[model samples]
Target: AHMDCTEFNPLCRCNKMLGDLICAVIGDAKEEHRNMCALCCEHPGGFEYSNGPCE
Candidate 1:
């Protein structure tokens, strides 16, 4: 299952301006995304987020 964003289907044109940096966690591994939009748009599903970048 995934969260569908309208822009995603037709090809996402995410904003160019930077958003809040965040980390996405899967199991014991953590990955960094440039921002929330990047994480949500790229990952869509199977990730839990934490504030700020991964340590």
Candidate 2:
């Protein structure tokens, strides 16, 4: 499942878009990311999350 990594690329900077927070899960640790760039950059692969912030 090779979805386009263009949006997640570290080189491709994320614009100052709205702070659409995302809830990411790595192992058993829960995390919050302000944007896709931040999430993808930090987590890279083998991660999961919802489209919204972690409650």
Candidate 3:
């Protein structure tokens, strides 16, 4: 499903499954701050990929 920030917020880091080009954002935020923003694929896998905040 196309997640909506209005009902929830992304709290966990993004991860991509093997052989999949897209990644999933798994996490949670307070109910009050759930719909404050949106998540997207801002980074792609690479040799320099770091599990840090998206650029």
lDDT of 1 by residue, 1-55 (tens): 1233323554435655466555666777666545446556565354576665454
Which RMSD values do the candidates have, in order? 4.7, 4.1, 14.3
For model 2, residues 1-55, the per-residue Cα lDDT tens digits are 2223334336337756577565666677666555556545545574466666453
Pitting candidate 1 against candidate 2, the one with the higher lDDT is 2
Arrange candidates, best lDDT first: 2, 1, 3
Q: Over the full model, what C-alpha lDDT does candidate 3 score relative to the true structure?
A: 0.27
Assess each prediction's global lDDT (C-alpha) against the native: 0.53, 0.53, 0.27
Q: Estimate each model's TM-score.
A: 0.45, 0.53, 0.16
Candidate 3, residues 1-55: lDDT per residue as tens digits? 2332222355323333322122234343211111122232331221122132332
- Clash tally, candidates in order: 0, 0, 1
